[PDB]
Write an enzyme that holds these catalytic residues in place. Structure first.
Site, PDB file in Angstrom:
ATOM      1  N   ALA A  38       3.361   1.763   2.936  1.00  0.00           N
ATOM      2  CA  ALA A  38       4.613   1.044   2.736  1.00  0.00           C
ATOM      3  C   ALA A  38       5.526   1.819   1.801  1.00  0.00           C
ATOM      4  O   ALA A  38       6.748   1.873   2.012  1.00  0.00           O
ATOM      5  CB  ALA A  38       4.340  -0.357   2.189  1.00  0.00           C
TER       6      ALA A  38
ATOM      7  N   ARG B 127      12.878  -3.975   6.229  1.00  0.00           N
ATOM      8  CA  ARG B 127      13.669  -3.599   5.066  1.00  0.00           C
ATOM      9  C   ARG B 127      15.059  -3.154   5.507  1.00  0.00           C
ATOM     10  O   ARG B 127      15.202  -2.367   6.455  1.00  0.00           O
ATOM     11  CB  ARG B 127      12.959  -2.480   4.300  1.00  0.00           C
ATOM     12  CG  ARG B 127      13.481  -2.192   2.908  1.00  0.00           C
ATOM     13  CD  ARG B 127      13.195  -0.745   2.606  1.00  0.00           C
ATOM     14  NE  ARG B 127      13.223  -0.384   1.196  1.00  0.00           N
ATOM     15  CZ  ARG B 127      13.474   0.849   0.767  1.00  0.00           C
ATOM     16  NH1 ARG B 127      13.756   1.812   1.642  1.00  0.00           N
ATOM     17  NH2 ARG B 127      13.480   1.114  -0.522  1.00  0.00           N
TER      18      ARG B 127
ATOM     19  N   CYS C 276       0.825  -1.198   0.000  1.00  0.00           N
ATOM     20  CA  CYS C 276       0.000   0.000   0.000  1.00  0.00           C
ATOM     21  C   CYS C 276       0.869   1.262   0.000  1.00  0.00           C
ATOM     22  O   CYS C 276       2.096   1.205   0.004  1.00  0.00           O
ATOM     23  CB  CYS C 276      -0.923   0.010   1.211  1.00  0.00           C
ATOM     24  SG  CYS C 276       0.015   0.120   2.773  1.00  0.00           S
TER      25      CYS C 276
ATOM     26  N   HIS D 183       5.242   6.455  -3.083  1.00  0.00           N
ATOM     27  CA  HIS D 183       6.439   7.154  -3.546  1.00  0.00           C
ATOM     28  C   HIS D 183       6.114   8.593  -3.897  1.00  0.00           C
ATOM     29  O   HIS D 183       6.800   9.523  -3.451  1.00  0.00           O
ATOM     30  CB  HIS D 183       7.032   6.463  -4.775  1.00  0.00           C
ATOM     31  CG  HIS D 183       7.397   5.030  -4.560  1.00  0.00           C
ATOM     32  ND1 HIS D 183       7.465   4.122  -5.598  1.00  0.00           N
ATOM     33  CD2 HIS D 183       7.739   4.348  -3.438  1.00  0.00           C
ATOM     34  CE1 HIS D 183       7.834   2.942  -5.121  1.00  0.00           C
ATOM     35  NE2 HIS D 183       7.996   3.050  -3.813  1.00  0.00           N
TER      36      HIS D 183
HETATM   37  S1  CLF Z   1      -3.397  -0.604   3.948  1.00  0.00           S
HETATM   38 FE1  CLF Z   1      -3.885   0.672   5.710  1.00  0.00          FE
HETATM   39  S2  CLF Z   1      -1.959   1.845   5.812  1.00  0.00           S
HETATM   40 FE2  CLF Z   1      -1.347   0.077   4.544  1.00  0.00          FE
HETATM   41  S3  CLF Z   1      -0.878  -1.507   6.120  1.00  0.00           S
HETATM   42 FE3  CLF Z   1      -3.084  -1.650   5.906  1.00  0.00          FE
HETATM   43  S4  CLF Z   1      -3.995  -0.428   7.832  1.00  0.00           S
HETATM   44 FE4  CLF Z   1      -1.786   0.146   7.251  1.00  0.00          FE
HETATM   45 FE5  CLF Z   1      -4.336  -2.653   8.313  1.00  0.00          FE
HETATM   46  S5  CLF Z   1      -2.399  -3.387   9.210  1.00  0.00           S
HETATM   47 FE6  CLF Z   1      -3.783  -3.172  11.008  1.00  0.00          FE
HETATM   48  S6  CLF Z   1      -5.776  -3.167   9.966  1.00  0.00           S
HETATM   49 FE7  CLF Z   1      -5.364  -0.945  10.481  1.00  0.00          FE
HETATM   50  S7  CLF Z   1      -3.356  -1.035  11.505  1.00  0.00           S
HETATM   51 FE8  CLF Z   1      -2.077  -1.240   9.787  1.00  0.00          FE
END
Ligand code: CLF
Ligand code: ICS
Ligand code: CLF
Ligand SMILES: [Fe+3]
Ligand SMILES: [Fe+3]
Lengths: 478, 522, 522, 476
Positions: free
Chosen positions: A62, A93, A59, A192
């Site tokens: 990340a 990472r 996402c 990015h």
């Molecule tokens: S798409 Fe969104 S920003 Fe990207 S990784 Fe996912 S929340 Fe985070 Fe999730 S894993 Fe748990 S359920 Fe909320 S906290 Fe974090």
């Protein structure tokens, strides 16, 4: 092996999908054709993932916190939201750095606001403001704070930009808001871009009126190297042996001050086009700084890049360039003489993120290996344009490959080696195909430059020729 | 440079003089780094009692948490069922993180899907994601069941899981008979173990709530076992071995040990083993239901007692000697099976190991953390070994839990110097290990950074880490270990006493300085 | 001086300033010690290639042997028989040592008796000692059998064991039918493993030689298993577990796992379990006999083939992947039983672990020692893992053995830098780890002194010890480990890779110096 | 007691055959305060009955493992087959300061590793070659001892001739020791053999030399083998009292210290059994007096410090009271903490030749009662000293058999047992806290004031450990 065979492999694999998914995935699978040069006639990319197909993508959080901002070592980065995101990404990472962790560097730590339901109902802006004060009390040597937004922040209406501007004025500190919520975009890629703009908007212009930096004709910046296992250090060493002065590294082992000095350089050396082309284009129009792409994977590409970079300067640098090339020549020739006989003819299939699926091909070819398939999680069309040049004719291309497709393609192609990520490694090891993590380098590295090629060659050989692979079938099951 | 016959990886390559001078030049030229004397001063300040007081005054900031979010546990729970695909309704980044987090702990594939909800699904809900997601998943990975949890974005916008799933069936995206249990798993509530509890209760309701009419408690003569959030393969195995030795018919509900340990034999198996839908359907006919980790199975308990009408026995997690005794004695009463000779001997072998080793364990001071049930079992066993659990931290623990642990400490002389912390993170723990230094840490890999901080103050201040818990990323195959039962107590005992002796050998290896105590026999 | 609430044992008590000044004055005053620079100078000399060449010219001096004498092996072999008392005809100090040696490795009681031969018996023989000895032991400790071996003073003197025992029974000191197998076990021949072989062959022929007429090979449908000198409890356990999993009938001939692991339940059990006299009487009726450690079971092999008429399979010790495969396939062919799914899967789980950890094992250089069969099994498995067994040392090895290991090395690229040494001791090995430094040692507790020596030259030269073998005195409960089969290969793999990663963690723990490579995930 | 103890003795002996019963009866006695001659109530230092699982060792253990082995700057050869030197390598914690392999060699195992060829032809040519190899590879060694194992005497080897020849050739101290394991009936004769080897080959070679600067306060610690540091914890007190400890025999001892001993003013004998022989010689040849002393526990240590100080002048006696006043608050805090946790608990001991009586006072200083004790290899003069330290009606046992020990423990039911490694795991399984009283269970030191702290800590950690509550399963 042939074009007609791979095309029939593509359509046979897609026979399993519902009709909608079928038609979509057919547009993300293609086979290379040396007559077609524009990806905008052969494959599409940077589209939403289909639901429920087990995509390998991440996402935007990340892509902003994980890859761009997180490596900046003397800033404190807040995973703003519930506890999950920051914990799964803590130290996953290997963007290496020099520093005293917890005192003046903070890369491998996990700072978070740990949202509870109160923060959902009432908002987190009052919570964020308190957290900034506590950070200042307990980590006084931090040189700036970023606020990496997780999914709920934008959904509940919080205004982190306001908190950033207010607290930043009150404390005279650089506080950077980043709206990188994971639901934005389709992958890490928009993370990015969001992150590049946050650098532009809150950091890069701080020294626009400063004239105290001592410039030289040979100032450069390494843009888009995140020092995976030291990758950026083993590149820097060559550039400065060639006579250049690396003013900054974005963002592997990078400090905020290095970032702020980058508008003073003469040339931006872009390794990762995908993640940093945005800020590179900005610096060319605003400050007039040119940028060029280069490749430090393998001796062939590293030599080529060194000469290209040297040609942008005067005769003295070009002379030192041929000095570096001649100095490391016997070392990488020794690596080839030892390891190419052990790998030549072997076939490789790749699946990575936004650069390496094309960038490491020349290194494999330097060891006589053949990249028969490659693909990106989140690349754009300009990446695939660059990939057709590097990839051989009739090889398989896959954008945002599903777990099902990747497995099926491997069963049919039967490559001698697979280079991909952690979620793929243990699938194919069990299938008996040697695997090498091409994100984390399987906790080895560096792989950039001449010192990196030696490790790279050693790593492919130890895994592809390992005795374990001939033991998978029990003698009594034959 | 590199020598082709002795290739150097990042360590120790970058210790070469040319890399060293290069890095020094980088720092001096462009990093604008705080001077080393200032860095030292601040570091030593971060080890003091005064910094600890500011540290524990934190209200809004969390540093180095010791917990994760609910969907992580819901995924682990779901993986424990036969040919089941875990399915997290929401945004796809969560799933990449869940799979990776387990990938690195178990060193195995981890199958999980998302329905990739984006900005547009946040304005109008993820109903369409659900419809296509379910159909795409079933057609592509051919699971016999899909267990649905949620990411935090799906929770905030208010997607009605039950309705969206019913609408997927009515509109024909998946068959009406296809099992799709669901549970809401808000990341901003509780932790990863709360998600396990929520997922399991969700799956339990799906197969039993509407079909209670024909069920008679005790008619299948089995005992149900609910393991909870469990990341050691040896713990599933030891529970099943002991009930088999006792001749006790049982049903382990959520059992991922097969899918988390498939063989490398030339083919990838996405599913393996797991508890069957037939087993979940028959579970109300069991004599009773035993919760192995009750402090994060509150919701399951209410359902099991409220709908199945079992009287869940009051049993602590079967860790250590007393609580494994109590577990087996209670299992004996329920099942009518006597504790067999083989378990009596194994118990006696554990007690033998305790007597052989009590000399080196006695009075050893420990800092420890983890989930609530795992921690209090570690605390109990340490008191039985004559050890002092000085610092007890449970980030996701609650007040009632802390009271139970405090009562356990008070009932032993070795709890006099112990304190239980709830809601505190590993940055809190780092301060405690400096101000009230223990001998060792027992915790997950995140502890390695606290051991590094202690060494930097000094070798005499270093606190070695002993890796027990989750996640363990920096050692290989410890997920194969056991921490439950006599077998788990034996493994824990051995690890603790040999960590003690390994450190003694380190401190007495100096020739003609301290090797007078470098004894061959210990 | 002592602080009551923080008592100091020898370490670090004698590091207090007043003890240091006392020790400094004692040395300066009355020890007449060589100057420190002359010590440092001679030490450096002992690490050189020059010293090594002098070291390997030794002919008469042995320094730090890696072996024991025969009777130690006859004792262990006897302890594996039901209610059997080991009895060493000769001088008593031997037995004190044999018991203490095993006491410290197993941390268990070890029962063995002497007939306390004295310088008087050196003139007129030990006949009277045997007569009173057997009657006293029988009446006092009530064994069902007494297995007789000898100390070296009995061998030199020439006591005719067979005649002394016949006379003991003839003159009424013990019943004629009371079993008293015997073996001559000269300390100045072979080593402790030879004593095992000699004892076992003695016991086998006692119960079978004069009863062969009614024997039919294969009539009892079992397979005899002869373990040899074995000091891991888990190696007796894994063998019996694999054969039961296959449905194979077997007689484990000499089984001490019970008596060396009795429960601590309030009572002392001098005897427990063990091979029955009747399993031995019926052994010739087996389908065949498998020797788990054939390179120190030669005499036994001649008897089982020469008298029992069994065709003993040519099989390596079941260590590592290949040799376990071969073991199970030969057992399958003899018994007519197929290899079950549960062993096929366990095999794949070992391979999965191999693929999981190969990048950290590849190229790792090792020095190792032990008994011949254990050593060659370790060499084989190291080669299977991609490791290089650089220094292979078997003090009690022979030429035929060394040729077999050399051929194993030559069949793999990971043996090209390996050398096999026989008749050399741990002082030879010390030179080898100084002049041709490996990464680790794999050996018994005596290796801790080589590690200490290497560290003294410098941290960059230290060779850490991995404890696998016998004896292990300075860690607790490793005797419970397993090294045979897939299970043992899994344990060794885990110990090896984690020893590598723990050492990497130590070398990258330096704050701001080397902790750039202090990864959370490995 | 009294009656119940003698009845227990007869009941235990009913299992023996006639010969053994009649012998074992003479080695078990109940202490009676109106009988002070041990001769009139117990026999000792006799041959062990065959096949009764004696705890005893041999004369090689007495000489190599006990007396010679601890001398740190000499190399000691275990001359014979390989077993003896391996089983006794580093098993006894006679601590020392040195650079092992370079100038010290205590925990190494040197041996001639006899093969059958050496049995047939003899080992004297092998020994000579072995000495040369030692000299080339361990140049900093200061002398060699040759510890004979069982075969050496039986095959007619002449290790004394090799010693004299090679010693003259190389100008080195080479000590032949005829401690073959078949000699004597226990470790005890090995002590005596070892003491005579010291006298005959080491102790007389600085009679010629006067270069040593003597003081009126020079002493020697005779019979402390520095188990866990025991000798260092004692030396410190003697030197705080103003004395100069010239040598430590043999714990952390150097050969040069041994050679210097004939120049001291007083020999302070801790272990009477192992070293009374050389103490008696040194009084005859050099006029040096010797006295026994006891550093186990504060009571005995104080009494000993004052008894030793009375052999010198008013200045030492004053420093003696200064040391007593210094350490008083330290052992009082130890008692104040640990006596309440140990008072009233009963102890049974079985050890070698001194500790079965020497540590009684330390136990009493913690309110504990020694209800039984015994030696492996003591003589009657030891038992004379034992009858005075043990309470009335307590059980005494010489060369106890495994069966005897088990049966006495079952009837007497002590709260604690202190014995050796061959006994530890028997009684742990029976549910009786056990502390090794040879190796100190890898703890210690136990001598002196600093040692009493560790001793008390150790007895408390074991006796009151939570493991002893859980041996019985709640379901049995
Ligand atoms: S798409 Fe969104 S920003 Fe990207 S990784 Fe996912 S929340 Fe985070 Fe999730 S894993 Fe748990 S359920 Fe909320 S906290 Fe974090
Ligand atoms: S020398 Fe003797 S058996 Fe006096 S042989 Fe033995 S280190 Fe014992 S009771 Mo082991 S006469 Fe020393 C002894 Fe006492 S080895 Fe130690 S503890 S005080
Ligand atoms: S009583 Fe004493 S210990 Fe026994 S032998 Fe004799 S000196 Fe020695 Fe050494 S080698 Fe082995 S253990 Fe014996 S049988 Fe020959
Ligand atoms: Fe795996
Ligand atoms: Fe034990």
């Amino acid at each position: 092996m042939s074009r007609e065979e791979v095309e029939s492999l593509i359509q046979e694999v897609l026979e399993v999908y519902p009709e909608k998914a079928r038609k979509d995935r057919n547009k993300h699978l293609a086979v290379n054709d040396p007559a077609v040069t524009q990806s905008k006639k052969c494959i599409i990319s940077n589209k939403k993932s289909q639901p429920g197909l087990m995509t390998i993508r991440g996402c935007a959080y990340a892509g902003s916190k994980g890859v761009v901002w997180g490596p900046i070592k003397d800033m404190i980065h807040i995973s703003h939201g519930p506890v999950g995101c920051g914990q799964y990404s803590r130290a996953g990472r290997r963007n290496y750095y020099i520093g005293t962790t917890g005192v003046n560097a903070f890369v491998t730590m996990n700072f978070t606001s740990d949202f509870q339901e109160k923060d959902i109902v009432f908002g987190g802006d009052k919570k964020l403001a308190k957290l900034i004060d506590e950070v200042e009390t307990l980590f006084p040597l931090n040189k700036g704070i970023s606020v990496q937004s997780e999914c709920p922040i934008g959904l509940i209406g919080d205004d982190i930009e306001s908190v950033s501007k207010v607290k930043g004025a009150e404390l005279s500190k650089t506080i950077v808001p980043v709206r990188c919520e994971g639901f934005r975009g389709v992958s890490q890629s928009l993370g990015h871009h969001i992150a590049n703009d946050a650098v532009r908007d809150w950091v890069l212009g701080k020294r626009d009126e400063d004239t105290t930096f001592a410039s030289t004709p040979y100032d450069v910046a390494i843009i888009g190297d995140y020092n995976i296992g030291g990758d950026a250090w083993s590149s820097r060493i060559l550039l400065e042996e060639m006579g250049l002065r690396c003013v900054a590294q974005w963002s592997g082992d990078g400090s905020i001050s290095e970032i702020e000095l980058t508008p003073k350089v003469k040339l931006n050396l872009v390794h990762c086009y995908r993640s940093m082309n945005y800020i590179s284009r900005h610096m060319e129009e605003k400050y007039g700084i040119p940028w060029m792409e280069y490749n430090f994977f393998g001796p062939t590409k590293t030599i080529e890049s060194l000469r290209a970079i040297a040609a942008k300067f005067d005769e003295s640098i070009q002379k030192k360039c041929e000095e570096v090339i001649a100095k490391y020549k016997p070392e990488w020739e020794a690596v080839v003489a030892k390891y190419r006989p052990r790998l030549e003819g072997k076939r490789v299939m790749l699946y990575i993120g936004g650069l390496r699926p094309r960038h490491v091909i020349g290194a494999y070819e330097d060891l006589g290996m053949e990249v028969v398939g490659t693909g990106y999680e989140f690349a754009h069309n300009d990446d695939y344009d660059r990939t057709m040049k590097e990839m051989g004719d009739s090889t398989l291309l896959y954008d945002d490959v599903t777990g099902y497709e990747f497995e099926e393609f491997v069963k049919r192609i039967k490559p001698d080696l697979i280079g991909s990520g952690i979620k793929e490694k243990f699938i194919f090891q069990k299938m008996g195909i040697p695997f090498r993590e091409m994100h984390s380098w399987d906790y080895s590295g560096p792989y950039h430059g001449f010192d990196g090629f030696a490790i790279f060659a050693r790593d492919m050989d130890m895994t592809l020729n390992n005795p374990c692979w001939k033991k998978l079938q029990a003698p009594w099951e034959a | 440079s590199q020598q082709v016959d002795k290739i150097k990886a990042s360590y120790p390559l970058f210790l070469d003089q040319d890399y060293k001078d290069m890095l020094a030049k980088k720092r001096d030229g462009f990093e604008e780094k705080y001077p080393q004397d200032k860095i030292d001063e601040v570091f030593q300040w971060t080890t003091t009692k005064e910094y600890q007081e500011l540290n524990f005054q934190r209200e809004a900031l969390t540093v180095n948490p010791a917990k994760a979010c609910q969907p992580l546990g819901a995924v682990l729970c779901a993986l424990g069922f036969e040919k089941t695909m875990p399915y997290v309704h929401g945004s796809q980044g969560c799933v990449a993180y869940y799979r990776s987090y387990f990938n690195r702990h178990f060193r195995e594939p981890v199958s999980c899907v998302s329905d990739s909800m984006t900005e547009d699904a946040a304005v109008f809900g993820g109903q369409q994601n659900m419809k296509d997601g379910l159909q795409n998943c079933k057609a592509t990975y051919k699971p016999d069941m899909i267990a649905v949890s949620t990411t935090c974005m799906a929770e905030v916008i208010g997607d009605d899981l039950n309705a969206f799933i019913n609408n997927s069936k009515k509109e024909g995206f998946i068959p009406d008979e296809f099992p799709v249990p669901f549970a809401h798993t808000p990341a901003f509530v509780g932790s990863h173990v709360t998600g396990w509890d929520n997922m399991f209760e969700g799956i339990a309701r799906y197969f039993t709530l509407k079909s209670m009419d024909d069920k008679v408690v005790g008619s299948n003569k089995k005992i149900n076992i609910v393991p909870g959030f469990e990341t050691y393969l040896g713990n599933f195995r030891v529970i099943k071995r002991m009930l088999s030795e006792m001749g006790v018919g049982y049903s382990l509900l959520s059992d991922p040990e097969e899918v988390l340990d498939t063989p490398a034999d030339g083919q990838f198996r996405m599913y393996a083993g797991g508890t069957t839908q037939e087993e979940m359907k028959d579970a109300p006919n069991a004599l009773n239901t035993v919760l192995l980790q009750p402090w994060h199975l509150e919701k399951t308990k209410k359902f099991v007692e409220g709908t199945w009408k079992h009287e869940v026995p009051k049993l602590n997690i079967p860790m250590g000697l007393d609580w494994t005794d109590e577990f087996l004695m209670k299992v004996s009463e329920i099942s009518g099976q006597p504790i067999p000779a083989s378990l009596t001997k194994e118990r006696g072998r554990l007690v033998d190991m305790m007597t052989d080793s009590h000399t080196w364990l006695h009075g050893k001071r420990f800092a420890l953390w983890g989930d609530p049930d795992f921690v209090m079992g570690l605390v109990k066993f340490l008191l039985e070994l004559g050890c002092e659990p000085v610092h007890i931290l449970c980030h996701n623990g609650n007040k009632r839990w802390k009271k139970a642990v405090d009562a356990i400490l008070a009932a032993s002389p070795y709890g006099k110097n112990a304190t239980v912390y709830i809601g505190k993170d590993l940055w809190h723990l780092r301060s405690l290990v400096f101000t009230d230094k223990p001998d060792f840490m027992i915790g997950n890999s995140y502890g390695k950074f606290i051991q590094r901080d202690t060494l930097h103050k000094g070798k005499e201040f270093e606190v070695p880490l002993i890796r027990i818990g989750f996640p363990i990323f920096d050692r290989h195959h410890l997920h194969r270990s056991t921490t439950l039962g006599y077998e788990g107590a034996m493994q824990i005992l051995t690890t603790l006493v040999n960590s003690i002796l390994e450190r003694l050998d380190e401190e007495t290896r100096g020739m003609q300085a301290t090797d007078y105590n470098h004894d061959l026999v210990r």
